[PDB]
């Protein structure tokens, strides 16, 4: 099916110390394959998936130098932003950045991204047309003008539609066993009496890959979203994911409800009913 | 593979 490659960068100012913290991680779909941590001893881009270990020294040297330039750039960005928003140097602030590409099932480019947040708020983003920038405020307008004078979007396009896609394909091939697999969820339901008149039905999906999945509760075939407790899909730690959805129902009415599970690895969607 | 151009804010 479809795939994506994403890099996630986090830089945090630390007034209490002599340097900011910078962490960069790369993912193919929901599998992390590299990391860089400004505070770690290696000072190199490190492998975090088996299939990236086959890349040679040239690769590790190049990713290391590039990521160190990212780190320096974001370090300066902290200062820049603090000045744009006239903030003191006494507080800790956060700059986040993500970029990458999506490809479809034919491994052809579908979408690209390049966006930032400051202190958890959207700062600037590349629009869907891949040619224009969304900048929410005056500060971001300043960044936008700097980028326009340097034709950043056009260069970014070359990366997003070229490099990103080509390397994503390389990775998909090299980690085929891992990356191009489909683990269908193992499902089951638990039941817990909460009171003398209500019970909790929880629908479980375990050991699935990739992370995307849909769990929905129905009552008499009617979608019950407005009353559903849904936890964040979570990592099992072995390259698979887990998730559950629960509804609180009147005791004696358990069988009126059904949990519906949708996943790529699933030929047909599953319908579960407490028995 | 990372981008090799490094825009600033």
């Amino acid at each position: 099916g479809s795939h994506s490659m994403r890099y996630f960068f986090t830089s945090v100012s630390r007034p209490g110390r002599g340097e900011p913290r910078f962490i960069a991680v790369g993912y193919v779909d929901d599998t992390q394959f590299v990391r860089f941590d400004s505070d770690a001893a290696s000072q190199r881009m490190e492998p975090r998936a088996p299939w990236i270990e086959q890349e040679g020294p040239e690769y590790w040297d190049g990713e290391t130098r590039k990521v160190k330039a990212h780190s320096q750039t974001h370090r300066v960005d902290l200062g820049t932003l603090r000045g744009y928003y006239n903030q003191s140097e006494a507080g800790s602030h956060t700059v986040q950045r993500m970029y990458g590409c999506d490809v479809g099932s034919d491994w052809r480019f579908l979408r690209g991204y390049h966006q930032y947040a400051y202190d958890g708020k959207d700062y600037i983003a590349l629009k869907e047309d891949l040619r224009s920038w969304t900048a929410a405020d005056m500060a971001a307008q300043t960044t936008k003008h700097k980028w326009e004078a340097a034709h950043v979007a056009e260069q970014l396009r070359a990366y997003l539609e070229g490099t990103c896609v080509e390397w994503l394909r390389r990775y998909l091939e090299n980690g085929k066993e891992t990356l191009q697999r489909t683990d269908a969820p193992k499902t089951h339901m638990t039941h817990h009496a909460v009171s003398d008149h209500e019970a909790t039905l929880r629908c479980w999906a375990l050991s699935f890959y990739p992370a995307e999945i849909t769990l929905t509760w129905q009552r008499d075939g009617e979608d019950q979203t407005q009353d559903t407790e849904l936890v964040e899909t979570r990592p099992a730690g072995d390259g698979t994911f887990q998730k559950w959805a629960a509804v609180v129902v009147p005791s004696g009415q358990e069988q009126r409800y059904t949990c519906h599970v949708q996943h790529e690895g699933l030929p047909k969607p599953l319908t579960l009913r407490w028995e | 593979a990372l981008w090799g151009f490094f825009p600033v804010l």
Partner: T-cell receptor
Amino acid sequence: MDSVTQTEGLVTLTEGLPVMLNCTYQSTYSPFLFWYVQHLNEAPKLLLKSFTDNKRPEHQGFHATLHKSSSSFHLQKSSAQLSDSALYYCALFLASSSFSKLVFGQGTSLSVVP
Amino acid sequence: EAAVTQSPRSKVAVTGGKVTLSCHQTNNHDYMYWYRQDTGHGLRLIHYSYVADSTEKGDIPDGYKASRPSQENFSLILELASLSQTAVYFCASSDWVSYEQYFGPGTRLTVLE
């Protein structure tokens, strides 16, 4: 890949005639090219960029149109002047997969004569 | 505006001798580069640097070392000069807009036996 090829040898041109210096390239990803100029005992300096739509950006009556299909970025000017005598470099900017760097051609000497 | 200075402007050295070329820049540029030009042609990257205290190999590393002691200074070192290193060396600097590089005036080095 990732290379530039420029007109070889001295190019002699009478003042008033059009300048045409060839630059072709091989690029792995979408191309970005630049002309730099160096006058005799001076430093090389940026002259023009392949940016800002289709294949036509530019400087002082110099201009260059990028034709990606034939991978061409020829330097042109309508009427050469004696002051244009210089060394002209075509450069490929590589920053998509590798660390930002300019890859310079051999440079083509232009001598405009009276 | 952006300027870049080099020293010495000229140097005569002997094979086996140690040569150090200096470049200075007050543009607040984090990026610096050393190139060589031969018989009035080419501009080949030897070493570069993207921040003070770091250095990276260019296209023609061999026979040269580089030093970035501060943001302002970038040195090219030939530990054992050879006849092959006779050339004109140009240093340059840039900010993040790295396709626009500002060049120094150049150093003419001739190595002799």
